[PDB]
């Protein structure tokens, strides 16, 4: 078959990086009357993206024809899959021309195609590299219109280009988007925010007088921890790297950070999504059987990830560590409820009194053994969300399938619900409880900023904050 042969030969072109041959096969296909499909185009886009951008000549046919191929693919009305967007972006990156990259996203839009975050990257990051804030903000407006939500790298580039063009309003807006969407910032973003607050433009942007009641109302309206009404105060910012004490009090300025509530409606929506996700990945009847069991049990004050409590910092499963955690959770329960222990059925062992205790927990309504083949993470997570209670795990809950849970609601929920264990020689096992404040960029009523750095494990490493406070 002619289409199957083209596929065969383009696959070989891809495997060898033979761009001049792929372009001859593409043309030969036009001359032969062979219709290209989604798959054919996706190989061509990949193959074309391997061509270099020409510094010492007019651009090479590889990238030049690649953009013509992308334009023809869209004109044919072939449906893009995830490899189309990825390969389209690789081409844009190779060309290193943000205007042409932005033209690709404009083309998609004009033919009713929803662009992906990675399609915008080459455009946004290209314009930001050139210091062209105006085009960067056009690309940003285009994303907002298309409902593609930026991540930290896009916001960081927007912040940097705003700083470069001395645009204090855009710096302010971008910092609010970082607060809203990212909460805690990477090292590179943290350093960039510090540079902003110490800069001349920051020193010279401000207001001496403002309506304290308009600030008050925006604080109530926003959910807490910010107001969004603009830079306040005047003069130089005193900018220090610092820490919060266990109560959320800044060690530099003594401001008490606030605790931001989670709207119960968001929690309901999240619980429904979690249930849907769990049923897609588990055997539906297994997960449903747990849901039915959970409805008949409780109440619970805590849910334990049994595997994690047994295994964290251990060379093999420690019944001691599991059992010590159960006991300690029961002790902090106001009515001494056993925590709900979630374990794999293969665990539920070798010492008779330990097996007897596991069976006693089960008989007390405080243990569920997840079935053969299951991923027990869905079970303890659904349990803690549904019971609105503490979740005891040292799992960071960020990688692999935890990415399916998103980066807005879930990190906020974790912060309020996750209990982690730590062990010392002097004291043994400790429960580390949720903080009494929210670890998020905060803007106070008087215009003081506290910016938290993102870290892997905030019990291992002491989290650095920026305190930016006007010196007058």
Ligand X SMILES: *C1=CC(=O)c2cccc(O)c2C1=O
**Which residues make up each annotated binding site for Mn(2+)?**
305, 376-377, 395
Q: Shortest approach of Zn ion to residue 444 CB, angstroms?
A: 9
Q: Is 154 in the site for Mn ion (CB under 5 A)?
A: no
Q: Burial letters for 409-424: b for 16+ Cβ neighbours within 10 Å, e otherwise?
A: bbbbbbbebbbbbeee
Q: How far is residue 421's CA from residue 142's CA, in Å, rounded to a whole number?
A: 45
Instruction: Please report, in range form, the residues annotated as the binding site for Zn(2+).
Output: 250, 253, 450, 467
DSSP-based three-state secondary structure for 256: strand
CB nearer Mn ion, residue 44 or residue 312: 312
Q: Is 249 in the site for Zn ion (CB under 5 A)?
A: no
Q: Which of the ranges 54-62, 103-111, 249-257, 267-275 carries the binding residues for Zn ion, by CB under 5 A?
A: 249-257
Q: Which of the ranges 106-114, 345-353, 363-371, 377-385 carries the binding residues for Mn ion, by CB under 5 A?
A: 377-385
Tokens standing for residue 370: 């997840």
CB nearer ligand X, residue 6 or residue 421: 421
Alpha helix (H) residue ranges in 111-258: 117-129, 133-145, 152-164, 168-181, 187-198, 200-204, 212-221
Q: Is 253 in the site for Zn ion (CB under 5 A)?
A: yes
The partner residues of 203 in beta bridges, in order of sequence, read: none
In order of 283, 370, 396, 431, the CA distances from 358 in angstroms are 25, 14, 26, 21
Quick one: which of 94, 104, 124, 252 contacts Zn ion (CB under 5 A)?
252
CB nearer ligand X, residue 259 or residue 455: 259
CB nearer ligand X, residue 90 or residue 328: 328
Q: Is 436 in the site for ligand X (CB under 6 A)?
A: yes
Q: Shortest approach of ligand X to residue 303 CB, angstroms?
A: 15
Contacts to ligand X from residues 246-305, by CB under 6 A = 259
Instruction: Please report, in range form, the residues annotated as the binding site.
Output: 250, 253, 305, 376-377, 395, 450, 467
Q: Is 152 in the site for Mn ion (CB under 5 A)?
A: no
- Is residue 447 within 8 A of residue 218, CB to CB? The reply is no
Closest CA to 88 of 126, 45, 47, 44: 45
Q: Burial letters for 262-276: b for 16+ Cβ neighbours within 10 Å, e otherwise?
A: beeeebeebeeebbe
Q: Choosing among Mn ion, Zn ion, ligand X, none, which partner's interface includes residue 182 (Cβ < 5 to 8 Å by kind)?
A: none
CB nearer ligand X, residue 49 or residue 438: 438
- Is residue 440 within 8 A of residue 174, CB to CB? The reply is no
Tokens standing for residue 334: 């106001």
Q: Shortest approach of ligand X to residue 247 CB, angstroms?
A: 9
Q: Is 377 in the site for Mn ion (CB under 5 A)?
A: yes
Q: Which of the ranges 50-58, 68-76, 212-220, 255-263 carries the binding residues for Zn ion, by CB under 5 A?
A: 255-263
In order of 21, 87, 144, 449, the CA distances from 93 in angstroms are 22, 10, 22, 36
Paired sense of beta strands 465-470 and 237-242, if any: antiparallel
Q: Shortest approach of ligand X to residue 258 CB, angstroms?
A: 8
Q: Count of residues binding Zn ion (CB under 5 A)?
A: 5
Closest CA to 25 of 53, 46, 3: 3
Give helix then strand counts, H and E, for the chain.
Answer: 20, 10
Q: Choosing among ligand X, Mn ion, Zn ion, none, which partner's interface includes residue 377 (Cβ < 5 to 8 Å by kind)?
A: Mn ion
Q: Which of the ranges 102-110, 128-136, 265-273, 372-380 carries the binding residues for Mn ion, by CB under 5 A?
A: 372-380
DSSP conformation class of 224: S
Q: Choosing among Zn ion, ligand X, Mn ion, none, which partner's interface includes residue 467 (Cβ < 5 to 8 Å by kind)?
A: Zn ion
CB nearer ligand X, residue 286 or residue 438: 438
CB nearer Mn ion, residue 147 or residue 399: 399
Quick one: which of 250, 274, 385, 392 contacts Zn ion (CB under 5 A)?
250
Q: Is 257 in the site for Zn ion (CB under 5 A)?
A: no
Q: φ, ψ for residue 318 (rounded to 5)?
A: -110, 105
CB nearer Mn ion, residue 49 or residue 308: 308
CA 142 to chain CA centroid, Å, is 21
Q: Is 223 in the site for ligand X (CB under 6 A)?
A: no
CB nearer Zn ion, residue 242 or residue 422: 242
Can the peptide bond before residue 299 be classed as cis, meaning omega within 30 degrees of 0? yes
Q: How far apart are the first and last CA of the chain?
A: 78
Question: 386: which residues sit within 8 A by CB, 6+ positions away?
Answer: 271, 294
Tokens standing for residue 285: 């009847």
Closest CA to 178 of 132, 134, 107, 226: 226
Q: Is 222 in the site for ligand X (CB under 6 A)?
A: no
Q: Choosing among Mn ion, ligand X, Zn ion, none, which partner's interface includes residue 222 (Cβ < 5 to 8 Å by kind)?
A: none
CB nearer Mn ion, residue 140 or residue 377: 377
Q: Shortest approach of Zn ion to residue 450 CB, angstroms?
A: 6
Q: φ, ψ for residue 389 (rounded to 5)?
A: -130, -175
Quick one: which of 434, 454, 455, 463 contacts ligand X (CB under 6 A)?
434
Q: How far is residue 54's CA from residue 58's CA, in Å, rounded to a whole number?
A: 6
Going through 371-464 in order, the beta strands assigned E by DSSP cover: 390-392, 418-424, 428-432, 442-443, 449-452
Q: Is 416 in the site for ligand X (CB under 6 A)?
A: yes
* Residues of this chain that bind Zn ion (CB under 5 A): 250, 252-253, 255, 467
* Residues of this chain that bind Mn ion (CB under 5 A): 377
* Residues of this chain that bind ligand X (CB under 6 A): 259, 416, 434, 436
């Amino acid at each position: 078959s002619p289409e199957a042969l083209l596929k065969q030969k383009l696959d070989m072109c891809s495997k060898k990086g033979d761009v001049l041959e792929a372009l001859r096969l593409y043309d030969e296909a036009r001359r032969n009357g062979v219709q290209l499909s989604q798959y054919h185009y996706n190989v061509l886009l990949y193959v074309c993206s391997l061509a270099e951008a020409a510094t010492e000549s007019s651009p090479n046919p590889g990238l030049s024809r690649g953009f013509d191929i992308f334009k023809q693919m869209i004109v044919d009305k072939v449906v893009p899959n995830e490899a189309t967007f990825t390969n389209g972006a690789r081409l844009a990156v190779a060309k290193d021309d943000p205007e042409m990259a932005f033209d690709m996203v404009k083309q998609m839009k004009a033919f009713g195609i929803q662009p992906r975050l990675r399609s915008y990257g080459p455009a946004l990051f290209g314009f930001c590299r050139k210091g062209d804030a105006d085009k960067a903000y056009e690309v940003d407006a285009h994303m907002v219109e298309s409902e593609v939500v930026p991540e930290e790298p896009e916001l960081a580039a927007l912040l940097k280009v705003s700083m470069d063009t001395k645009n204090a309003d855009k710096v302010y807006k971008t910092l609010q988007r970082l607060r809203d969407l990212v909460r805690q910032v990477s090292k590179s973003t943290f350093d960039m925010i510090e540079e902003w607050f110490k800069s001349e433009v920051a020193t010279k942007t401000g207001v001496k007088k403002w309506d304290v009641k308009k600030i008050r109302d925006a604080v109530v309206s926003g959910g807490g921890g910010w107001h969004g009404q603009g830079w306040l105060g005047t003069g130089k910012w005193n900018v220090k790297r610092t820490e919060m004490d266990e109560n959320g009090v800044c060690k530099c300025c003594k401001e008490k950070l606030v605790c931001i509530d989670i709207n119960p409606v968001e929690t309901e929506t999240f619980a429904a999504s979690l249930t849907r996700l769990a049923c897609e990945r588990e055997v539906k009847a297994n997960f449903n059987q747990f849901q039915e069991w959970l409805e008949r049990h409780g109440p619970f004050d805590a849910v334990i990830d049994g595997a994690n409590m047994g295994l964290v910092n251990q060379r093999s499963f420690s019944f001691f560590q599991l059992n010590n955690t159960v006991q300690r959770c029961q002790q902090i329960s106001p009515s001494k409820r056993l925590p709900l222990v979630i374990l794999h059925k293969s665990r539920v062992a070798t010492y008779p009194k330990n097996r007897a205790l596991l069976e006693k927990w089960k008989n007390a309504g405080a243990l569920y053994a997840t079935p053969p083949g299951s991923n027990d993470d869905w079970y303890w997570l659904y349990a803690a969300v549904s019971c609105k209670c503490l979740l005891v795990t040292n799992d960071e809950m960020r990688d692999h399938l935890f990415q399916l849970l998103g980066n807005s609601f879930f990190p906020r929920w974790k912060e309020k619900h996750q209990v982690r264990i730590s062990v010392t020689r002097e004291d043994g096992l400790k429960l580390n409880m949720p903080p009494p404040y929210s670890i998020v960029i905060q803007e106070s009523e008087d215009g003081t900023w506290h910016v938290p750095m993102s870290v892997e494990d905030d019990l291992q490493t002491s989290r650095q904050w920026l305190c930016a406070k006007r010196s007058k």
